[PDB]
Structures are given as C-alpha cells and as structure tokens.
Amino acid sequence: SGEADCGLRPLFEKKSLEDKTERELLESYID
Amino acid sequence: TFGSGEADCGLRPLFEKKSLEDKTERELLESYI
C-alpha cells in the first residue's frame, strides 16, 4: 500500500511548501 | 628532404616502388568523390 498517497512529500506538498528547485521543473513545461 | 628523404616520402619500397598495390588501398581510392 501507499499508492493512494504516493508522490506527495510530507515536508513539502503536505505542508504546502516547495523545494528550492521544483519551480525550475514546472517552468520547463512552458518551453 | 629534411633529414628524412622527403623527395621519396610516401612511396613504400615494397608497393609503390615495385608497382604493387596493397590489399585494401583500393577501398581508399574508391572513397574519393
């Protein structure tokens, strides 16, 4: 088990916090 | 001839000199286009 909640980080997505570079990932989607 | 034998460089005694063609030099010649 764990799939229902997979991919969600306790110290980040769960606390509505971003890590220092994930923003950079999102931006790559927008050429 | 800078020491060497410039005047005769590139001509192998056992091939170009004896008018003999080595096994694969033709493959090289064919690539010229």
Place this chain on the structure above:
Amino acid sequence: IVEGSDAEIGMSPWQVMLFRKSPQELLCGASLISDRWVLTAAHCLLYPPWDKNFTENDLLVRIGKHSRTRYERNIEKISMLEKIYIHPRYNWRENLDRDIALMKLKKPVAFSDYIHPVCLPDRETAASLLQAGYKGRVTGWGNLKETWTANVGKGQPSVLQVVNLPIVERPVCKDSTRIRITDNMFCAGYKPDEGKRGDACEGDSGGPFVMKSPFNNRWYQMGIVSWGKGCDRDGKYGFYTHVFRLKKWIQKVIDQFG
C-alpha cells in the same frame, strides 16, 4: 551527481540506498514505490562485466537517509531483501535495454517525513510529461566529479545530491552514442551549449528520475538512472530506463508476489 546540490531534508523521501552486506559498501541507488517494494536498475544487481551478481542476502537497503556518513537515528531505516526480480528481457550484453529490477523488502517500512513512496506513471502522465525539453530530477550519492582517472576515494558526497536534467530528443541522443537506444529507454542531460551543467554518474545507477506533474502535484518516477556519464571521460547524455514503458512488467511482478 556532478554539478548538483545538497538535497533538502525529505526532498526525496522515496530515495533508497542499495548496499552490499560485507564488506559494507554502497552499491547503487533505488526508489521506494510502496511499503514493501523498491525499484532499481538491473545492472546494479547483475552485470558480469563488472563481476556483479548479487542475491537477496548479499544486499541490504537504507531508506530515509540524508547524510552518507552520520547515522540518522530514528530517521533512517535498514531493511533486508526478501526477493530480487530482474526483468527477464534485460540485455546487458549490448545496451542495458530493460535495465530494471524490483526488490521486495522482508518487512514493510514505515512511512514518515523522511520516507514516502513515489508514484509510477500512467499512460496520460507518461505521454504528457515524458517530452523533450521538459525537465526531470535525478538524485543520488555517486561521485561529485570525474572518476575515469585513478582513485575512488575522492569525490564522495556527504549528503544526498540532487540535479534537474532536461529530457533529450530521441534522435539527438541516438547520434550521441554507438549504443542501440531502444524505446524502453530515454536520454536526459544538457547540451554543452546551455550554461546550466549537472549530470548523473555511474554511482547514481538505479536511482530515480522523477518529474512533478503540474496536473495533480504528485512526483512521478519516469525513469531509472541506467547510465549516467557525468563522471566519465566523455559521454554527451545520460541513459534512463523508461519506467512507464515497463510498467506492465512492474505490475505483473507486484500483482503476484505481494
């Protein structure tokens, strides 16, 4: 990881460390995809060229870690292996095609701020995110620099390293290697143009290549570090195992042994 940075605490809770029991040496990286399953690269377990042939007992796993040295009490977790599953069509003789493997932990691991599984992609996410230009994130403990010269001692990271790499166009990388790149793999890495440097090294093999879906905010494991070359004498791009492409197999194994 070359030109990366220190991972923040709990930034990659699915991070797993593959070890050899004796002598206790860190071998590869891997990812937590559930309480009892761990994903890694096959050549980390079986690769005759480097005298590698491991069985469930030779290995040991460490989850939740952030510092390679310091023991993190009540944070990291060790786990023995119950069974090793290497994809049947894994071709190590030629191109490391289908370079993937599953490892079932003897006992499930408890999740926490430092331990949480990562999602596997579904058709829509793979098709949507696995595109050239898009960036993924690679993490691991491989060397911080060149390892083609002598000595293994230097260049070992003290804490988990992280770096974001863009997905490369299939033809662009097929032209970067004399290695047959199958559909079961994809390349990633910056072209020497782009200023931004950063890359995965051999010691990062088996670790995860993740992307954060902007559609649901969940991190997905799109690939497995199959061949990082940041630390080699040369190597334009890194090779990764296309996870979605092998999901059918991943499910078959899981949907039968646990």
Place this chain on the structure above:
Amino acid sequence: IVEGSDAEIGMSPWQVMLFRKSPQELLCGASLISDRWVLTAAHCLLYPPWDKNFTENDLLVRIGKHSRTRYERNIEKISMLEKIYIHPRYNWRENLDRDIALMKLKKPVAFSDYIHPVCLPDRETAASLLQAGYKGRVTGWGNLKETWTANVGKGQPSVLQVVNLPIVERPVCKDSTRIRITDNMFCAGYKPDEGKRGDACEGDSGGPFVMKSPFNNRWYQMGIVSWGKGCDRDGKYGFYTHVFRLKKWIQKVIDQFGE
C-alpha cells in the same frame, strides 16, 4: 585496432613503436616523417590524468616491426631519443587540442624495404583529401577488443593491425561527444548502422592516419590518433590531431632543432 586486419610486410614502413624505457612497456604508436624525426601524440608523453610525464631519457623507440612477438632479424631497428617536443599550446586538461609531439632520434635511422618516411600534407593535399566520406588508414598495436572491463592481458595483437576509416563531418562528430572539438582535429569512424565495422583504440594513440594521394600516389599523414574509442564502453567516433593544421609548428621545430 578493433575489427581491423593484419598489416602486410612493408605496408606501413613509417610505423614506429614508442616504449617506456623501464619498466619496458609499449606505450603508443608513432610515425617516421624523416630519418631523425618521429611524430606521435602529445598525451602519449604527457598526460597527468594517467600518471604520464616522460622525457627523452624515459623512452625508447622501435622501427620497422611487423610482429610484436618475434625479434625481426636484420629488419627492425631500436633507437633512443635525443629530445622530445610537445606542442606549446597542447591542451590536456580539456580536449586534447593540439595533441601532437615530435621526437628526435639520437641518430638517423636507415631506410629500407621496411623503414620509410611518410609525407606531410601541404595546403592542397589537405583540402583535397580531408573531406567527409573519404577514407584514411589507421595502424597500430592497440587492443583487438573491449578494454573497459577487467584485465589488460587478453586482446593484444601479435602483428601490426590496419584499418580504413571514413572521415566524419564535423557537425556529426560534435553530435557524438561533449568534448570541445577544435579545428586542429577531425573525426573518423563508421556509423553504427554499419555494413563496415572497425575503429582505433586507446592503444593506437600516436599512430598515423594516412591517405594515399590519387594524384602522385604518395601516402600522406593527415592525422594522429588522439582518442580512439573502439575499445571503450561507448564512443561513436575517434579524434585525430589534424596534422596539416599544425604543420607550421612541426616545420618550426624541425627547422630549429634539426640540421
């Protein structure tokens, strides 16, 4: 050389073997351009990355050999080196740009059926022959197969190997490497969708890349094996030191340290 064939006696009479004086070990390949001058790869003599930093007295050279095993009675010649010259702008930290060095023999070697100097291209020969698709020849005692796994033992050729490789287009070459290729070098090799296999290896470094002029039918040394990747884990094409591009330095040295 990987996937090549045995050279014929006297086929590459300008072939030179560079040895470490002690312990005695074969290091690189080289070519005879005169009776006192030998051309080779700079990283063969100096390459800190691999504990290599040789001077004239650390080396020894054998000329006219066809077999590495048997001693060649009245054929091969062994010679010491008076001085070596590594290109001043030789870059070993980044891309082996200007990977070239000259070695002057203690005494002139005598030409024969088995020892003859190769020519150095002029502007015209270079411009006429250094073109994508055109094939050149590579010779050497590098390994016959994969050398990225363990052991160095197996894979050593008993006789000089030879292989003909096509010159590769610069942009195409750059697509295969992350090393900054300069105009003082070129690449060669077949495409993996080969109908033709064959490549130079690390052991062939310093050896010559020759082309026969269809005009005066002489053999010219267009390049120097700088980085052959045939025995490596990967590597689409090899890197050769562009000899004509560096001729001014070659002639300068020869003109200043030779009679």
